[PDB]
Design a protein around this ligand. Structure first.
Ligand SMILES: *C(=N)[C@H](C[C@@H]1CCNC1=O)NC(=O)[C@@H]1[C@@H]2[C@H](CN1C(=O)[C@@H](NC(=O)C(F)(F)F)C(C)(C)C)C2(C)C
Ligand SMILES: *C(=N)[C@H](C[C@@H]1CCNC1=O)NC(=O)[C@@H]1[C@@H]2[C@H](CN1C(=O)[C@@H](NC(=O)C(F)(F)F)C(C)(C)C)C2(C)C
Lengths: 299, 306
């Protein structure tokens, strides 16, 4: 037993990380087959479309470990630059590019000079930011899920907002949230709590013998969602209640039963108690995360 | 900016994990050059685990009683030897993916990454601390035994923990990679309970310095303290004594923030006296003790946000 904020094994992604230099700008690239993907801001209100067509190939210094890759082509896709190189990455995993929804979780491999430094677990916030841990040179660091042996890349890191939270794109260069890759004034919107994830975490508490917060009462979506949006919680939809099904049977607490416990916790707080060693309601574990860690699924 | 329970990238440990089978017992092993290291209780059956005589169970085994599997490849065992509570299986192939490594015994308070494994396949990576009472708060199911804890320093992997068992309080016990248990535990299903746990004071102070570095000062006060007055108060909250070594180790974080270690001790003292006042620090409503001074310096700017 035990419950931990657990990342995916980073091995397969570690094999894809390289260093990209264009002038004084250094950051991280993802080398898949014969293409390196990185933030287009490496070339730097700029003018990218124009800037890149001007720039020749030997201007992009691409270092993989000690080796250098020769760039035989460039091209823009939204906010990501694609650098064509002479050689396919022999360590290339089975992979795809996915776009995740807010509330969905993923593992970040934090990198500096194409060198992996750390791995942590993240949720795409409702306001399309992530609460990451990123310094200078972190740009091009990626977010991923692993499904059997297939790496789904969902995030590339671009920037830090003034509140200390982070913004990036999918691997096709589409931003998460209403942001731009320009030195301009940008803020995170007001965030909400991922209700379905809090409930999933309460089910993990129960599975691990942490049960003081349960009660006799049940509720309805309406009454709950009226209390929720008061405490800046996402609406719990009927889809959410379906996903929690597995955990509701496996424990014998009913989702609208668990909604009554969570209501009670929002109104009365914790009474100097913890749940799985937290004094806050944790919203960065999906139902899938909880079933996977409490089942022991491997990669 | 930001502050996360970061683990080390697991790739270099992933390439070492194998599955070890003895009769009906399968657990994970660690394949480094031509040796596979695993918990010796792989040779135990259901009837052995209360008073196993390992020397006696082992003398009754051939090399070919050990099935070792690295992905699809069954490796061939050519030698076996017990060292403390680890079995070492000599195999015909040296692991081509063996990293630069060493084995280290860590002290309570020290952190490391755990690669949770089942059937020699990795399930996930998380960060742990050796609790003062020599346990870890892991996430570990049936078959997780042989999973390892590690730090990475440039390219070199220091193996510090191997998982053996779960104690009645839901917390975990294991050995160094020389097979010597952390704490007063034994690889037997006999009555075993963890010492009462304590908060790792030096680590909480480190994490308060992290909070100042990311620009949060709401919990500082204008007081100082003697180390001894601080320790007299800290013991009353089940905090580990802070020693002069601990104060020395905090020197750098003190210099980066301009806040004296004993002034940070005055803040912690007040935080214990009052709690959070419905406020949080680095996203936690509790005082965090699983970040070392080395961790904070590693993950934090080097330039304080004010
Ligand atoms: C990539 N290597 C860095 C990562 C940053 C640095 C501090 N922590 C991080 O996550 N990315 C950048 O430097 C990007 C890059 C220009 C400016 N920038 C920022 O992150 C800046 N923020 C913003 O521009 C703002 F306000 F809009 F969010 C900075 C002020 C340096 C934090 C570009 C092209 C956006
Ligand atoms: C390794 N595969 C397991 C790991 C355990 C299983 C559940 N969670 C874990 O981390 N190791 C064992 O099953 C060891 C093994 C015999 C018994 N054992 C235990 O962990 C048991 N606990 C104890 O014996 C206790 F509490 F006294 F320390 C168990 C009750 C099954 C969790 C041996 C030889 C110690």
């Amino acid at each position: 037993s035990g419950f931990r904020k657990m990342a995916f094994p980073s091995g397969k992604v570690e094999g894809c990380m390289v260093q990209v230099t264009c002038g004084t700008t250094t950051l991280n690239g993802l080398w898949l087959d014969d293409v390196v993907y990185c933030p287009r801001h490496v070339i730097c209100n700029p003018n990218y479309e124009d800037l890149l067509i001007r720039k020749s190939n030997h201007n992009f210094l691409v270092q993989a470990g000690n080796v250098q890759l020769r760039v035989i082509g460039h091209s823009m896709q939204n906010c990501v630059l694609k650098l064509k190189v002479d050689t396919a990455n022999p360590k290339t995993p089975k992979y795809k590019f996915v776009r995740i929804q807010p509330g969905q979780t993923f593992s970040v491999l934090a990198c500096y000079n194409g060198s992996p430094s750390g791995v942590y677990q993240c949720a795409m916030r409702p306001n399309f930011t992530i609460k990451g841990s990123f310094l200078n040179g972190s740009c091009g660091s990626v977010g991923f899920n692993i499904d059997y042996d297939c790496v789904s890349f969902c995030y590339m890191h671009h920037m830090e907002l003034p509140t200390g939270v982070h913004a990036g794109t999918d691997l096709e260069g589409n931003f998460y949230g209403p942001f731009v890759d320009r030195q301009t004034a940008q803020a995170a919107g007001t965030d909400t709590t991922i209700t379905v994830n809090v409930l999933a975490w309460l089910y993990a508490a129960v599975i691990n013998g942490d049960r003081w917060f349960l009660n006799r009462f049940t509720t309805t979506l309406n009454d709950f969602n009226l209390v929720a949006m008061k405490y800046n919680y996402e609406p719990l939809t009927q889809d959410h209640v379906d996903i929690l099904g597995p955990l509701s049977a496996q424990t014998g607490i009913a989702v609208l039963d668990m909604c009554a416990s969570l209501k009670e916790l929002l109104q009365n707080g914790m009474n100097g108690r913890t749940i799985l060693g937290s004094a806050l309601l944790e919203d960065e574990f999906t139902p899938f995360d909880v079933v996977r860690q409490c089942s022991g699924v491997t990669f």
